[PDB]
Amino acid sequence: WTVDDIVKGINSNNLENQLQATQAARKLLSREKQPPIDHIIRAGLIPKFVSFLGRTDCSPIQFESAWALTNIASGSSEQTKAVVDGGAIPALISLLASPHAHISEQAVWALGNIAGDGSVFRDLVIKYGAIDPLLALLAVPDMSSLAGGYLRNLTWTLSNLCRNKNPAPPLDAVEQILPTLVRLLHHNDLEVLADTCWAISYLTDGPNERIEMVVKTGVVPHLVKLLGSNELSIMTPALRAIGNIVTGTDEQTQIVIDAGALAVFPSLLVHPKTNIQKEATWTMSNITAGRQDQIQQVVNHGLVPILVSVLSKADFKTQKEAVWAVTNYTSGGTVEQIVYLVHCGIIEPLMNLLTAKDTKIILVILDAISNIFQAAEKLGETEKLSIMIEECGGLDKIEALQNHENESVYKASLNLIEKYFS
């Protein structure tokens, strides 16, 4: 069909010709690499499709109109705005409650696309009351009976409602959606599990209030259980969510620790995948920045020797995370914990990393050395640390940082050498 024929049929007043024209329109939009969306919009067909969305007597016209509107919406931002300005969101929300499951799934899919194009359209989908009917679709007698694709489409739409920032999803909507996400976390489909973990990850990436809501629902134990999955698709988002959670309060970090997360990290910190290693070391760096008893729990799980090994053998991107973990350990740790860290052999790898060109990393390493020296002072063992640092060639490294090319680095190294290596 040509666009002229489609416009003729849609304005025909005969339902059958209108259905034929709508199917031709969705076909024209999907099959053509570059479809004439601008012509379709100037012809005023978006209001026509939106009106067809309410034709309960004819299910095909509803399905095909939703398809055409979603194809139009998936293009440029102006086209998405044209769809939203035609009244499509409320009509699709009304379509959510249709008795036909394929029509309801089509509406879920369309609303998910709209909400995924941006945070403003997301808030518009929420403001017109989509969350209640969408969640009602998952209030089925048996969730295991629902088809995989339908459940996956619902999980994807709900995730897109939990995604995007500036602005972030309203807190009331997150509080209404999270319980259904928790129920979805108990499903056996890997795709649903992964999408739900990513949604939880999106929700935990924010202020501590949203993290508090998330931990209040009770997802952390299942997230730690999923950390032990042999599927990377499920392990990666679980690790991301746990990492975001440990960036919050000390009590939320303690929720993560009590769930048994520290016993899973011995293998994650040496995982073959570099992203897993970096994310695990970042999570551990956020854990070592906690209370002294939480650092003690890190020590009791034998993670400090593994972290020393990571600081020594991993790539620079992972070694930066390890440096931050070590510096937080030395900043917040007891004297006993710092002497334990030194006995595990942290000095040599830190001094070897003093050769990097990242000024922030250099200064962080020097600050960690200063904290270790302060612990030594409190014990009266300053000279022992000085001797150890000179033995591994560390004082040579600190002396090589005495270059006026970088005044901050130079001042840091000068203070260190004048206070402990004089």
Side-chain angles (χ1 to χ4, degrees), residues 63 106 181 332 344 396:
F63 190 83
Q106 192 74 344
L181 294 179
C344 291
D396 298 347

Side-chain angles (χ1 to χ4, degrees), residues 405-416:
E405 186 179 352
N406 189 322
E407 196 59 21
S408 301
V409 160
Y410 174 100
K411 190 56 179 180
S413 52
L414 178 60
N415 294 10
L416 196 71

Side-chain angles (χ1 to χ4, degrees), residues 48-361:
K48 304 284 173 59
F49 296 139
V50 170
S51 62
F52 292 155
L53 289 182
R55 298 275 246 275
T56 53
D57 52 321
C58 184
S59 68
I61 197 106
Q62 297 181 309
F63 190 83
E64 302 288 355
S65 299
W67 204 345
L69 286 168
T70 306
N71 285 345
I72 294 169
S74 281
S76 79
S77 60
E78 177 184 5
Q79 294 160 0
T80 313
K81 181 179 177 181
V83 169
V84 172
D85 291 343
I89 289 176
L92 293 166
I93 288 169
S94 298
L95 200 52
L96 284 175
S98 165
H100 311 292
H102 67 281
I103 303 295
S104 180
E105 185 174 4
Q106 192 74 344
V108 172
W109 174 68
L111 288 166
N113 278 267
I114 293 165
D117 284 324
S119 48
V120 181
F121 299 129
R122 180 205 69 209
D123 288 354
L124 282 168
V125 167
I126 296 169
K127 179 165 189 177
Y128 287 120
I131 295 173
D132 290 75
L134 285 167
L135 297 180
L137 284 179
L138 296 173
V140 303
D142 188 355
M143 197 165 59
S144 305
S145 300
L146 287 180
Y150 182 62
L151 191 65
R152 278 152 35 201
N153 212 315
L154 271 292
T155 305
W156 172 77
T157 296
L158 280 175
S159 180
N160 283 9
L161 291 174
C162 302
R163 201 174 176 187
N164 300 305
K165 293 171 181 60
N166 295 336
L171 283 169
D172 291 338
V174 175
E175 195 178 12
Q176 188 180 349
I177 291 172
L178 275 167
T180 302
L181 294 179
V182 181
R183 286 201 288 110
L184 287 165
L185 275 175
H186 302 172
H187 206 259
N188 306 84
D189 193 67
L190 303 176
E191 305 296 338
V192 172
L193 284 163
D195 287 17
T196 311
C197 284
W198 275 115
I200 294 293
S201 154
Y202 305 146
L203 293 173
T204 52
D205 187 5
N208 300 8
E209 186 175 14
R210 221 174 297 271
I211 301 171
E212 181 65 6
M213 285 179 42
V214 170
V215 306
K216 275 180 174 167
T217 70
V219 295
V220 175
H222 273 277
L223 287 171
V224 172
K225 181 193 176 168
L226 294 164
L227 280 179
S229 175
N230 303 330
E231 301 286 350
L232 280 165
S233 58
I234 294 167
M235 182 199 308
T236 301
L239 184 54
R240 179 69 56 80
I242 292 290
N244 290 327
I245 292 164
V246 295
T247 72
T249 66
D250 297 337
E251 290 71 24
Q252 297 157 353
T253 307
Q254 195 62 74
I255 291 168
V256 168
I257 294 165
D258 294 354
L262 294 176
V264 189
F265 278 108
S267 70
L268 296 166
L269 294 162
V270 302
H271 198 270
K273 276 60 178 61
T274 56
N275 288 343
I276 300 295
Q277 294 179 242
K278 182 177 67 173
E279 295 276 319
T281 310
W282 165 67
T283 309
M284 287 305 307
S285 80
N286 289 311
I287 291 168
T288 53
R291 299 190 301 259
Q292 287 173 341
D293 53 1
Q294 301 173 329
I295 299 169
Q296 191 60 65
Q297 299 218 46
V298 173
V299 166
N300 296 341
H301 280 82
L303 295 162
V304 173
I306 296 171
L307 285 165
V308 172
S309 180
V310 168
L311 190 71
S312 311
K313 304 177 186 176
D315 62 312
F316 185 63
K317 203 164 53 175
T318 304
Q319 285 180 333
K320 285 185 290 184
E321 298 298 346
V323 162
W324 274 106
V326 169
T327 311
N328 298 335
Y329 186 109
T330 56
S331 177
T334 67
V335 175
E336 302 81 27
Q337 293 164 351
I338 295 167
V339 302
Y340 173 69
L341 181 67
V342 170
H343 287 314
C344 291
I346 197 71
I347 300 299
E348 178 176 353
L350 284 172
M351 303 306 299
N352 293 337
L353 283 163
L354 281 178
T355 63
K357 273 65 172 173
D358 189 339
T359 300
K360 295 190 289 296
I361 290 293

Side-chain angles (χ1 to χ4, degrees), residues 362-378:
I362 284 165
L363 295 169
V364 169
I365 292 167
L366 292 168
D367 184 60
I369 299 166
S370 295
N371 297 333
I372 295 164
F373 264 114
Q374 287 177 1
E377 287 177 343
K378 291 189 192 66

